[PDB]
Amino acid sequence: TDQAAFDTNIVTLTRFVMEQGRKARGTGEMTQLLNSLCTAVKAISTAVRKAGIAHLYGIAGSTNVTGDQVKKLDVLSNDLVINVLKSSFATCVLVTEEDKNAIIVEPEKRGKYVVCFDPLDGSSNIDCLVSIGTIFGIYRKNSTDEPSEKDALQPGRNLVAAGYALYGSATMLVLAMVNGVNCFMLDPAIGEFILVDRNVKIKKKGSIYSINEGYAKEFDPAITEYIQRKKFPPDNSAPYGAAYVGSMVADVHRTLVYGGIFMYPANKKSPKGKLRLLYECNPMAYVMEKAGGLATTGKEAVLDIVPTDIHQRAPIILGSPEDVTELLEIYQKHAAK
Amino acid sequence: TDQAAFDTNIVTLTRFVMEQGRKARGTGEMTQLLNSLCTAVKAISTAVRKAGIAHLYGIAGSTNVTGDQVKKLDVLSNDLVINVLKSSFATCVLVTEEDKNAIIVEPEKRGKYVVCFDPLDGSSNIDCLVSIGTIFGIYRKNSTDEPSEKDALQPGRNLVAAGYALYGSATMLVLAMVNGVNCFMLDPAIGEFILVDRNVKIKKKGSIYSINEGYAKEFDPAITEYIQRKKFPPDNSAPYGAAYVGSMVADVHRTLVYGGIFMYPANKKSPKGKLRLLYECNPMAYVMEKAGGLATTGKEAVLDIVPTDIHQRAPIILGSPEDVTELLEIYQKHAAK
Amino acid sequence: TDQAAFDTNIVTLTRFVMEQGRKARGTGEMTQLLNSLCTAVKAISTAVRKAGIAHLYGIAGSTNVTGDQVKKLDVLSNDLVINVLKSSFATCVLVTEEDKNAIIVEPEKRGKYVVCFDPLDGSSNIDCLVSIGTIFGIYRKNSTDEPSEKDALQPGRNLVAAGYALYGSATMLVLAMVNGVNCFMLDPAIGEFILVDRNVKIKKKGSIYSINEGYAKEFDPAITEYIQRKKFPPDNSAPYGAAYVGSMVADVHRTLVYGGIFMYPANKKSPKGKLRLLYECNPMAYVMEKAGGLATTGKEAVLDIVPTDIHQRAPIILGSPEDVTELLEIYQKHAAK
Amino acid sequence: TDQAAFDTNIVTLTRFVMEQGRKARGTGEMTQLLNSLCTAVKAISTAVRKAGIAHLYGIAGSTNVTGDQVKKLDVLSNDLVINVLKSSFATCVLVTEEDKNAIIVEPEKRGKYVVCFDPLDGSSNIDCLVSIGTIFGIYRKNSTDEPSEKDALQPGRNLVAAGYALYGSATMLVLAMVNGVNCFMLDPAIGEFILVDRNVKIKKKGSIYSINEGYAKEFDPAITEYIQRKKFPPDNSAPYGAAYVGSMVADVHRTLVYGGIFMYPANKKSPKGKLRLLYECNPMAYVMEKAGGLATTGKEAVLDIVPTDIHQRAPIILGSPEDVTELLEIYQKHAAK
Ligand SMILES: O=P(O)(O)OC[C@H]1O[C@](O)(CO)[C@@H](O)[C@@H]1O
Ligand SMILES: O=P(O)(O)OC[C@H]1O[C@](O)(CO)[C@@H](O)[C@@H]1O
Ligand SMILES: O=P(O)(O)OC[C@H]1O[C@](O)(CO)[C@@H](O)[C@@H]1O
Ligand SMILES: O=P(O)(O)OC[C@H]1O[C@](O)(CO)[C@@H](O)[C@@H]1O
């Protein structure tokens, strides 16, 4: 249909819960949440435009000496991305990798929305200005009793909203709850978030794939098989392209468009991959599923584990329900016993 | 005291009610409000950097032909500054000058916080880039029954938060409720509001005054008396300075600092002045009082009238409790009968 | 369907100064210290507007630093300029307010220009948060001599252009040249003082006087037996309004975009006015007479003054041809005995 | 107490190019089309990043505009550049991608430079929202002749500088000159490509190859019987990782700030590579060999190519001295029969 109108309007993130929220007859408590992170999708959004060199220590007021000499900004990100959560007065179990374990919230600033986020999708190789941003997750807190680190030990299948934050050039927060996916391209001129492509649905026939191809030898003859099919497509087909930003997001957000498919299991160096799942190989996985995007580990659906530790890691391979789920009959071609 | 610390923190506006709000054991409903205006203290904040010439029609997507040929942006301001209020789902009586009368809110997006604002402190003479911004007001809706235009007919004395928005260079939202005043200097780099001088208290001994001195002849021998005292300070004193931006804000925000005092009654041309009080000669008046700032009309305390019409206008003279209230014994020197 | 978004042939100051000097093979060295002056102004806007991430607000504590009575933003904003400029080499002589004695740029550079200015005049009135600005002229000199203070000593009728801005609701760099009055507005999207306000000439007999009537008893016989003239135009008709910003910078702005009577008479502390030739008289006033707006001092004029000190208070008095000629005629007639 | 806030002697690109050319009286005309090229890039960052107030998103409707397969941001971003540039006069010759045939700038201007470029290469990969960029070289020519296509036809070993940027997590304008590799980062606070990343040279034998292994069956004998070499370095040790951005621009970036093996071999649709001399080979590759990083094509090199068409696909293959020499040695040895 065609009628893309003129201005006098915007679509923030507040409105998304401010609106849908009451339609669910509630408190607007679920919302006390993500704004603090919305406020973050801009906060660090811009930190990297500067993160490069003469911008951080001194030239920004950085004095909370954290680390040995391998970082500080990263910690500074989450360093306000912590109490900000307390500033919402509704935080329960503030789940964060930065800390060995979470931090159980004080009697006062407590709710029933356990935020489980990665305060940084390993920006590390920030020296190139690649596609990175924020990460998060949450549960409507299943239990009741004095919240210990505990409950952040919950599957995405019983998690109604796990998510990231992509600052490419476009700071665009794709918010999604237990119903669909929706991106909020920000507007700095107005320091305001603005939705853009109303509702997302995972594509079905891609053409680019993601995993690390720099890694031939060590990989397995089951994954190093799905590989063959792209390179050497079998019944007279055309070779799958690829672009590996390296990132989980910057490749698992391409998936949100054109046609990408991450592949990343036990890299042999590591027994499961490189994503500390509970706020790594999950937020994305969840967002795709709502969108009708079949997420998984290759040997297990990413949203269905008994979280055997907070900072536990895991694999994720998702994209085209024909292409990413194609690996079933690849893992199922390599069938020896 | 001295300990002005380093970074890793910010003080928005959300937090002010998100925080104080629960300390009042409520819904966070009062807050669904002003964010939409917070979102505005930035929204138009920047409209004037452009408002000047090659920025508006076409070059911004302006097509909702309002007026004869004397404006459009102004209407465009409030043009989104309207439904934005509906986007909060808690709006009752959206009070706005732009319209002859308010607009009574539909059953759905209704609360118990009647927002009474001036969507524009007569920017008109925008051709100079002077000190202007937003305006507002609100009541915790006293009645109950089907809200007609009605209730926006309420005194500031039974109004717990009337306010403006000053974009000088510094977009700084001084929020205040029934308890004190607090300004939120924005940060565009993060499109985020940031409080600055914790708590305000009206000064007591100024040195600059505001009213229009271009107007000798028509003024009265009671106001054209307070005048004498400044020009010709009596018992061997020094002449009061002045700077009349022209604006109500840009002079009644100076009052918030250094030492100003607006004077502005029936300009004779008009029977009460030029401020359509209920969202003009009031927001400020109220903000000063909390701060221990004695507001008034000269012949009546600005926060105590039976609102004899929505768009009704009125006078306001406030500042130093010795200086602005000095007029009592001036109005009281000119005592004839 | 059709697509429309923005300007793709933008008129950058760089682009008018790169094509305006073509009247006679402009050499291509004017904009040298112009785009090099530029960056400074461009920058200083967010001083008053922003806080970086923390400015004077937070760093040590509320220490009683009463040993001086001048803000610190006054040297970081000055040096910056005195530093961005010398790098284009074109410098010759230097004179400011936030400095002392004539400082120069070695015969290891040098070009042909003598910019006389003030870092960001007003400063203090940014505390009351007014949208103030800054005066700043430049010189194309006649000298084989090594930069003595006697070199800057030239009246307005001998400059190349005068310039200033006002970081108010968008900075607008303003400069006067052989062809007239332009007005460059600033795009923050890219940080750009673009020509979006071409030529500018005011209204012949503008109904708006200008000055702080609070100084009533301080001015000489003219202005006074000249004030009520405007108060109630002897012609019985339209009396003058007043939007006297309060801060000198805009005292010239608003007026310009209109037509009014701004000025400064010799009072008590000012038996020679107070707004220095080299930085008030020759820039803004050179902008003015050249704008087609009469500019005055006291009895004499700015376009003809030679200081003893590069910091010599030369009065100022300006507006529309009729608006000010009336007054110089006031003087004419006020020759008295 | 002490006061600290920012830099007050900033190193503007304008300021390095205004002082770098002093090696021998730089004439002061280099930065002419440089600050005039500048504004364009400076601008184009918010194309991908912003939407003005509305871009392609909202204006008419989702009309099936399938008559073409190239975005519209491709001409507003091009023209803009081809328009900001001609205004400095210094132009000589013009060659792009988003245009056709040699377009020039009349003998009513002209200067000495021939900037060959692409408006914003990548475009499309901004839909998937990747932080892409743009290649754009410039020429200081040898010609008494009237601008024939035969004039641009010069290899890299005959330029004055090559340049590009990547509007990713802050645009960084990058340009190579007689003295080496710099890296100007962009301050949006004032819109400034400043020198905050001085000199830059990579790691000698960088453990990170570069290219889309998805193209496996498409490249010539070298890369292939060269791939597993890096997969498992014959030295048994450290195998190469891969952060192949996916988009050519950063395919040169990240690498640079590290050390890797980026390249492009002649495949099916590319029996002459695909990344044109005048805009891929001579800019970025001139940036490279001059960066101290071996740059290649196929058998021959970029620094020595003469096109039939100003749009002639010249392959590209580059990285660290050891990283690529191994490969040109691969060719050496791969002389075969
Ligand atoms: O090892 P690679 O291929 O460079 O991938 C980068 C990895 O680092 C991270 O940023 C971890 O923080 C992951 O999300 C990501 O998978
Ligand atoms: O008439 P003056 O002195 O210029 O004052 C401007 C007036 O216009 C307004 O902006 C009205 O919108 C008032 O708030 C203000 O008092
Ligand atoms: O009220 P006063 O004493 O005339 O001071 C205001 C004037 O003085 C200044 O401080 C300097 O001229 C300006 O900002 C303004 O023009
Ligand atoms: O996966 P492919 O087919 O090699 O395409 C990606 C490459 O092509 C381009 O589109 C042009 O080189 C670049 O962005 C990138 O280097």
PDB file of N, CA, C and O in Angstrom, chain D residues 2-43:
ATOM      1  N   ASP D   2      41.839  23.954  40.791  1.00  0.00           N
ATOM      2  CA  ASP D   2      42.149  23.851  39.358  1.00  0.00           C
ATOM      3  C   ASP D   2      40.909  23.642  38.481  1.00  0.00           C
ATOM      4  O   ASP D   2      39.913  23.058  38.922  1.00  0.00           O
ATOM      5  N   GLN D   3      40.979  24.139  37.249  1.00  0.00           N
ATOM      6  CA  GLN D   3      39.895  24.008  36.283  1.00  0.00           C
ATOM      7  C   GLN D   3      40.435  23.338  35.018  1.00  0.00           C
ATOM      8  O   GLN D   3      41.507  23.705  34.527  1.00  0.00           O
ATOM      9  N   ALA D   4      39.691  22.349  34.519  1.00  0.00           N
ATOM     10  CA  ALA D   4      40.043  21.587  33.316  1.00  0.00           C
ATOM     11  C   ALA D   4      38.753  21.266  32.556  1.00  0.00           C
ATOM     12  O   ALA D   4      37.751  20.883  33.172  1.00  0.00           O
ATOM     13  N   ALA D   5      38.783  21.400  31.229  1.00  0.00           N
ATOM     14  CA  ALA D   5      37.593  21.148  30.413  1.00  0.00           C
ATOM     15  C   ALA D   5      37.833  20.591  29.009  1.00  0.00           C
ATOM     16  O   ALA D   5      37.205  19.610  28.618  1.00  0.00           O
ATOM     17  N   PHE D   6      38.711  21.226  28.238  1.00  0.00           N
ATOM     18  CA  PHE D   6      38.966  20.761  26.883  1.00  0.00           C
ATOM     19  C   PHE D   6      40.256  21.263  26.242  1.00  0.00           C
ATOM     20  O   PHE D   6      41.133  21.802  26.916  1.00  0.00           O
ATOM     21  N   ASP D   7      40.358  21.043  24.934  1.00  0.00           N
ATOM     22  CA  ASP D   7      41.504  21.452  24.125  1.00  0.00           C
ATOM     23  C   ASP D   7      41.284  22.880  23.614  1.00  0.00           C
ATOM     24  O   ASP D   7      40.209  23.222  23.082  1.00  0.00           O
ATOM     25  N   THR D   8      42.310  23.710  23.792  1.00  0.00           N
ATOM     26  CA  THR D   8      42.264  25.090  23.339  1.00  0.00           C
ATOM     27  C   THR D   8      43.483  25.394  22.471  1.00  0.00           C
ATOM     28  O   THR D   8      44.255  26.308  22.759  1.00  0.00           O
ATOM     29  N   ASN D   9      43.625  24.598  21.410  1.00  0.00           N
ATOM     30  CA  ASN D   9      44.704  24.687  20.422  1.00  0.00           C
ATOM     31  C   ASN D   9      44.487  23.461  19.545  1.00  0.00           C
ATOM     32  O   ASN D   9      45.436  22.760  19.176  1.00  0.00           O
ATOM     33  N   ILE D  10      43.217  23.186  19.254  1.00  0.00           N
ATOM     34  CA  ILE D  10      42.844  22.014  18.474  1.00  0.00           C
ATOM     35  C   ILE D  10      43.530  21.856  17.114  1.00  0.00           C
ATOM     36  O   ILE D  10      43.848  22.844  16.445  1.00  0.00           O
ATOM     37  N   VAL D  11      43.807  20.593  16.767  1.00  0.00           N
ATOM     38  CA  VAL D  11      44.454  20.217  15.508  1.00  0.00           C
ATOM     39  C   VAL D  11      43.386  19.843  14.507  1.00  0.00           C
ATOM     40  O   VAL D  11      42.955  18.700  14.422  1.00  0.00           O
ATOM     41  N   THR D  12      42.921  20.843  13.785  1.00  0.00           N
ATOM     42  CA  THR D  12      41.896  20.663  12.776  1.00  0.00           C
ATOM     43  C   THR D  12      42.558  20.130  11.527  1.00  0.00           C
ATOM     44  O   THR D  12      43.752  20.370  11.318  1.00  0.00           O
ATOM     45  N   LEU D  13      41.821  19.392  10.706  1.00  0.00           N
ATOM     46  CA  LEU D  13      42.421  18.912   9.465  1.00  0.00           C
ATOM     47  C   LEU D  13      42.938  20.180   8.774  1.00  0.00           C
ATOM     48  O   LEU D  13      44.094  20.241   8.342  1.00  0.00           O
ATOM     49  N   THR D  14      42.087  21.208   8.767  1.00  0.00           N
ATOM     50  CA  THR D  14      42.403  22.513   8.200  1.00  0.00           C
ATOM     51  C   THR D  14      43.777  22.924   8.746  1.00  0.00           C
ATOM     52  O   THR D  14      44.650  23.315   7.972  1.00  0.00           O
ATOM     53  N   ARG D  15      43.976  22.706  10.056  1.00  0.00           N
ATOM     54  CA  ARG D  15      45.206  23.056  10.777  1.00  0.00           C
ATOM     55  C   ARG D  15      46.442  22.161  10.552  1.00  0.00           C
ATOM     56  O   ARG D  15      47.552  22.533  10.950  1.00  0.00           O
ATOM     57  N   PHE D  16      46.277  20.970   9.976  1.00  0.00           N
ATOM     58  CA  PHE D  16      47.463  20.137   9.720  1.00  0.00           C
ATOM     59  C   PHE D  16      47.865  20.370   8.276  1.00  0.00           C
ATOM     60  O   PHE D  16      49.058  20.441   7.958  1.00  0.00           O
ATOM     61  N   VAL D  17      46.843  20.571   7.436  1.00  0.00           N
ATOM     62  CA  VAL D  17      46.997  20.816   6.000  1.00  0.00           C
ATOM     63  C   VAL D  17      47.408  22.271   5.771  1.00  0.00           C
ATOM     64  O   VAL D  17      47.858  22.638   4.692  1.00  0.00           O
ATOM     65  N   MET D  18      47.266  23.092   6.806  1.00  0.00           N
ATOM     66  CA  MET D  18      47.639  24.511   6.748  1.00  0.00           C
ATOM     67  C   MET D  18      49.071  24.660   7.269  1.00  0.00           C
ATOM     68  O   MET D  18      49.694  25.708   7.116  1.00  0.00           O
ATOM     69  N   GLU D  19      49.586  23.602   7.890  1.00  0.00           N
ATOM     70  CA  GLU D  19      50.937  23.640   8.430  1.00  0.00           C
ATOM     71  C   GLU D  19      51.850  22.538   7.901  1.00  0.00           C
ATOM     72  O   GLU D  19      53.075  22.619   8.056  1.00  0.00           O
ATOM     73  N   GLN D  20      51.264  21.528   7.257  1.00  0.00           N
ATOM     74  CA  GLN D  20      52.036  20.414   6.707  1.00  0.00           C
ATOM     75  C   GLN D  20      52.681  20.808   5.384  1.00  0.00           C
ATOM     76  O   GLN D  20      53.844  20.499   5.135  1.00  0.00           O
ATOM     77  N   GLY D  21      51.929  21.534   4.562  1.00  0.00           N
ATOM     78  CA  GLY D  21      52.438  21.973   3.273  1.00  0.00           C
ATOM     79  C   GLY D  21      53.524  23.030   3.369  1.00  0.00           C
ATOM     80  O   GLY D  21      53.964  23.574   2.359  1.00  0.00           O
ATOM     81  N   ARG D  22      53.975  23.321   4.582  1.00  0.00           N
ATOM     82  CA  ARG D  22      55.014  24.319   4.788  1.00  0.00           C
ATOM     83  C   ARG D  22      56.420  23.816   4.491  1.00  0.00           C
ATOM     84  O   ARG D  22      57.382  24.584   4.547  1.00  0.00           O
ATOM     85  N   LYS D  23      56.527  22.543   4.127  1.00  0.00           N
ATOM     86  CA  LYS D  23      57.808  21.930   3.801  1.00  0.00           C
ATOM     87  C   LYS D  23      58.542  22.727   2.722  1.00  0.00           C
ATOM     88  O   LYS D  23      59.765  22.675   2.630  1.00  0.00           O
ATOM     89  N   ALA D  24      57.787  23.460   1.907  1.00  0.00           N
ATOM     90  CA  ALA D  24      58.367  24.273   0.845  1.00  0.00           C
ATOM     91  C   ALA D  24      57.357  25.291   0.323  1.00  0.00           C
ATOM     92  O   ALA D  24      57.007  25.276  -0.856  1.00  0.00           O
ATOM     93  N   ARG D  25      56.882  26.165   1.213  1.00  0.00           N
ATOM     94  CA  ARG D  25      55.912  27.203   0.861  1.00  0.00           C
ATOM     95  C   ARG D  25      54.743  26.565   0.109  1.00  0.00           C
ATOM     96  O   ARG D  25      54.569  26.784  -1.089  1.00  0.00           O
ATOM     97  N   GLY D  26      53.925  25.808   0.833  1.00  0.00           N
ATOM     98  CA  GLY D  26      52.796  25.108   0.237  1.00  0.00           C
ATOM     99  C   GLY D  26      51.784  25.839  -0.627  1.00  0.00           C
ATOM    100  O   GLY D  26      50.785  25.235  -1.022  1.00  0.00           O
ATOM    101  N   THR D  27      52.003  27.125  -0.893  1.00  0.00           N
ATOM    102  CA  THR D  27      51.101  27.931  -1.719  1.00  0.00           C
ATOM    103  C   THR D  27      49.766  28.252  -1.035  1.00  0.00           C
ATOM    104  O   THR D  27      49.197  29.324  -1.251  1.00  0.00           O
ATOM    105  N   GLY D  28      49.279  27.340  -0.199  1.00  0.00           N
ATOM    106  CA  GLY D  28      48.026  27.564   0.501  1.00  0.00           C
ATOM    107  C   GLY D  28      46.789  27.286  -0.332  1.00  0.00           C
ATOM    108  O   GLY D  28      45.731  27.857  -0.064  1.00  0.00           O
ATOM    109  N   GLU D  29      46.913  26.391  -1.315  1.00  0.00           N
ATOM    110  CA  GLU D  29      45.794  26.034  -2.198  1.00  0.00           C
ATOM    111  C   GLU D  29      45.435  24.530  -2.221  1.00  0.00           C
ATOM    112  O   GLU D  29      44.548  24.105  -2.968  1.00  0.00           O
ATOM    113  N   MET D  30      46.108  23.737  -1.384  1.00  0.00           N
ATOM    114  CA  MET D  30      45.854  22.293  -1.280  1.00  0.00           C
ATOM    115  C   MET D  30      44.494  22.092  -0.603  1.00  0.00           C
ATOM    116  O   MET D  30      43.525  21.639  -1.238  1.00  0.00           O
ATOM    117  N   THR D  31      44.415  22.523   0.659  1.00  0.00           N
ATOM    118  CA  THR D  31      43.201  22.440   1.476  1.00  0.00           C
ATOM    119  C   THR D  31      42.016  23.142   0.823  1.00  0.00           C
ATOM    120  O   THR D  31      40.901  23.071   1.327  1.00  0.00           O
ATOM    121  N   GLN D  32      42.278  23.842  -0.277  1.00  0.00           N
ATOM    122  CA  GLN D  32      41.261  24.562  -1.028  1.00  0.00           C
ATOM    123  C   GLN D  32      40.111  23.600  -1.298  1.00  0.00           C
ATOM    124  O   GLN D  32      39.036  23.747  -0.713  1.00  0.00           O
ATOM    125  N   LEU D  33      40.344  22.589  -2.134  1.00  0.00           N
ATOM    126  CA  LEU D  33      39.290  21.616  -2.406  1.00  0.00           C
ATOM    127  C   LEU D  33      39.267  20.551  -1.308  1.00  0.00           C
ATOM    128  O   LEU D  33      38.428  19.652  -1.328  1.00  0.00           O
ATOM    129  N   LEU D  34      40.184  20.650  -0.349  1.00  0.00           N
ATOM    130  CA  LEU D  34      40.206  19.687   0.747  1.00  0.00           C
ATOM    131  C   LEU D  34      39.128  20.000   1.792  1.00  0.00           C
ATOM    132  O   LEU D  34      38.361  19.101   2.160  1.00  0.00           O
ATOM    133  N   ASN D  35      39.039  21.264   2.230  1.00  0.00           N
ATOM    134  CA  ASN D  35      38.021  21.705   3.206  1.00  0.00           C
ATOM    135  C   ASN D  35      36.695  21.808   2.433  1.00  0.00           C
ATOM    136  O   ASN D  35      35.613  21.765   3.027  1.00  0.00           O
ATOM    137  N   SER D  36      36.800  21.937   1.107  1.00  0.00           N
ATOM    138  CA  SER D  36      35.640  22.001   0.213  1.00  0.00           C
ATOM    139  C   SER D  36      35.146  20.562  -0.135  1.00  0.00           C
ATOM    140  O   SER D  36      33.995  20.352  -0.523  1.00  0.00           O
ATOM    141  N   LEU D  37      36.040  19.580  -0.025  1.00  0.00           N
ATOM    142  CA  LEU D  37      35.704  18.171  -0.233  1.00  0.00           C
ATOM    143  C   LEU D  37      35.066  17.806   1.106  1.00  0.00           C
ATOM    144  O   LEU D  37      33.932  17.328   1.183  1.00  0.00           O
ATOM    145  N   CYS D  38      35.835  18.102   2.153  1.00  0.00           N
ATOM    146  CA  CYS D  38      35.509  17.927   3.572  1.00  0.00           C
ATOM    147  C   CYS D  38      34.001  17.993   3.856  1.00  0.00           C
ATOM    148  O   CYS D  38      33.349  16.961   4.019  1.00  0.00           O
ATOM    149  N   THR D  39      33.453  19.208   3.862  1.00  0.00           N
ATOM    150  CA  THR D  39      32.033  19.457   4.140  1.00  0.00           C
ATOM    151  C   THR D  39      31.086  18.348   3.671  1.00  0.00           C
ATOM    152  O   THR D  39      30.127  18.008   4.382  1.00  0.00           O
ATOM    153  N   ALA D  40      31.400  17.762   2.511  1.00  0.00           N
ATOM    154  CA  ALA D  40      30.619  16.681   1.911  1.00  0.00           C
ATOM    155  C   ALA D  40      30.611  15.449   2.818  1.00  0.00           C
ATOM    156  O   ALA D  40      29.556  15.054   3.326  1.00  0.00           O
ATOM    157  N   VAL D  41      31.787  14.857   3.011  1.00  0.00           N
ATOM    158  CA  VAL D  41      31.965  13.681   3.876  1.00  0.00           C
ATOM    159  C   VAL D  41      31.290  14.001   5.220  1.00  0.00           C
ATOM    160  O   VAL D  41      30.338  13.330   5.672  1.00  0.00           O
ATOM    161  N   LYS D  42      31.789  15.087   5.803  1.00  0.00           N
ATOM    162  CA  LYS D  42      31.327  15.613   7.070  1.00  0.00           C
ATOM    163  C   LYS D  42      29.831  15.461   7.090  1.00  0.00           C
ATOM    164  O   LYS D  42      29.266  14.923   8.028  1.00  0.00           O
ATOM    165  N   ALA D  43      29.223  15.849   5.981  1.00  0.00           N
ATOM    166  CA  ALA D  43      27.792  15.795   5.836  1.00  0.00           C
ATOM    167  C   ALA D  43      27.214  14.407   5.680  1.00  0.00           C
ATOM    168  O   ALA D  43      26.372  13.993   6.484  1.00  0.00           O
TER     169      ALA D  43
END
